[PDB]
Amino acid sequence: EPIRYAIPEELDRGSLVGNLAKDLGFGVGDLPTRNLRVIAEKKFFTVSPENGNLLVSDRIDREEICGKKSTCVLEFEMVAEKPLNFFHVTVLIQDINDNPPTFSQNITELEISELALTGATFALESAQDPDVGVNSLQQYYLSPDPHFSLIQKENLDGSRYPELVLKAPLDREEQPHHHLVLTAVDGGEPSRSCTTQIRVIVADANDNPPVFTQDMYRVNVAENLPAGSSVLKVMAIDMDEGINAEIIYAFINIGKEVRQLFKLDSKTGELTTIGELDFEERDSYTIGVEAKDGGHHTAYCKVQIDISDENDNAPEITLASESQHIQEDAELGTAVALIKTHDLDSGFNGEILCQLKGNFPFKIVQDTKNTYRLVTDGALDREQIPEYNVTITATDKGNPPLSSSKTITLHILDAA
């Protein structure tokens, strides 16, 4: 007595499903007497009281009636009178491929670190289809890209899900963004498909240490350079982004003498002077500079600062005699005083030009480069001139030249 029908969905109104009168055992000679009618809350089917045919009365949407279920049957009861009996009739609703697949969003972003090795797999969102059977069985395809390919796996139930695979190492410094196109096609008839774009954003990793522009920063400055003047400026380049690009500068293997003279800026990297320079103390400074970033990548170089000599030291005069006493009966050629000169500067700034200022019965005789002797030249007499105030002047050969004077008193004593 139970009878099942199998018709496709989305059939036009009035389509023939089956002759219930003949399939049960009725006859056109008794159609009006039994008065067939369908009893169901959903007016999906109707029975013609003329020939006993089962027709379609409303739109039969399998996605709205059954959803994602495999089988889809509609059970109702047909009522016949004289006598009154029940006739259970079931109608299987076949599924057609009338719904294309779809993704969650058209544009999907995916952040991938550039440290990802070749062969790394990243999960991609699958497409959904309200159909069932082969009409929902998706087949995923990816547009050709030299860096990415597609992996299509299956679950334990047979559904396919795509996964992105990396076949070439990523580099943000070469290409930070990639644009992919994923396509999903179902296995129904006709084949309906949809597309979606995948924007791969390459995340930055500290894959590049700082690099100085020069491995040696050499400069020459003056001796009396004012405190707080710019000496040079180191520069380090980092191709990364964010914390992996901020560079800090500092000194290495440095001493306290240098620490009180120079100062290196951590941010700008400009080298200045906080102390005083002196050529007579030190004429060269070899300093090492370290460059650090966020990922603790180090970069080392050397800085050499040469100092030129300036004429800032005056010539010094030293004298010595026999208690500043002279005998009036001394012969021509007798040494009376000894002159010693020296200058702390170098080059022509240290060369001293010694001479005698004023007229006196004495004469300066040069022995070596820095030694002189005050030799008598004229007459001496205590009764006439008892003392002489010899003034010695020394002058260097600098620019500007410095000088210094020193007067010594020489007494004249009686003869024997």
Next chain:
Amino acid sequence: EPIRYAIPEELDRGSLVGNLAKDLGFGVGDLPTRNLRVIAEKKFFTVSPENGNLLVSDRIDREEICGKKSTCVLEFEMVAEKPLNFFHVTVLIQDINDNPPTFSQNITELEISELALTGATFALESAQDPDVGVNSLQQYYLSPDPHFSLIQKENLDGSRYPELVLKAPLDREEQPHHHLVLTAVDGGEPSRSCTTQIRVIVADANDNPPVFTQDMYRVNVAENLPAGSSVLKVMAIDMDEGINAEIIYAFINIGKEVRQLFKLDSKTGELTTIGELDFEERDSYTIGVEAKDGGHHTAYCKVQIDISDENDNAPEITLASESQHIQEDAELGTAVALIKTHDLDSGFNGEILCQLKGNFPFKIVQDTKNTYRLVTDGALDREQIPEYNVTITATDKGNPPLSSSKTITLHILDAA
């Protein structure tokens, strides 16, 4: 005439440097006549006017006089009178190892990332010594450590500088801090040395992805669960520190039906319900959960939520008859009305118990599980009782059980 002396430094006052009278060509028979005396701004040496010996007058510190210079000579002039002449005398000051080396600071920290490969080199600060020659030539030693060794290189001038080398990979999750001891010994006599501690702080890198406690979170909840109730709580463990340890939770491959029913917290990871559950619509939910951290390390699992059926649907009654008309001359056994019942619930909650309420000349006969027939049992007469109000009651076998009634009017017609 020029004469040079070579004496060590830090000699006691009055030590003999040399006999200037004999080394030049004088004689004890003429010591007081010439009256020897030293002329220098620094009172480092003196000449004895008795025997003509050159002695030490003050402390001679080579580090204070010459500093870091290789050679160290002191030039002065000795003055003799009757006659007056100059005698240039130089004294070379030999260096002794009377100053130990030293570092900048006793405690030195060094941050090293755990991603450092075996053999990585890290610069260490060198020790400084105010001495010169072999007295300042340092020899660095490192205490034995299973992870670190010492590399000793030399510059172009011969000075040694240490560098730390890594022979075993570092792991912050195993040991975040290391304590090293660096020792510097000079090549003088006696050997003076100093020590310094190096605190190596292992910087954290994303070397551990999130790990779920369970690969499957299965739970069973009721059907009419109130919106906003806790379902379960996923948990992911990350052994890293900082941004590399913060975990965010989200859904993957999810649909709109699920998105309007459940909600996953990104921070706490607690799963709640924002919609309504229904067993008649869907009895199982398989959801995938993704765990992401700062370094974009992914972790996937699955969550299955089973729903139990609740008796929240009342039995439905459907009736049909011959236009609600009965002939008074009907035989015992004639079908008058057809009863159809069904319940949306499952199990014993769907089993329907149909019966007739009130005394009537009718009887309910059960055909199948859900079909009944109202069969006459007694006498009928329109002149006496023209109509009957048959009330059919259906009740399920749930807890608590539901029920529904439906009264149909049956008219009695005359005979033929």
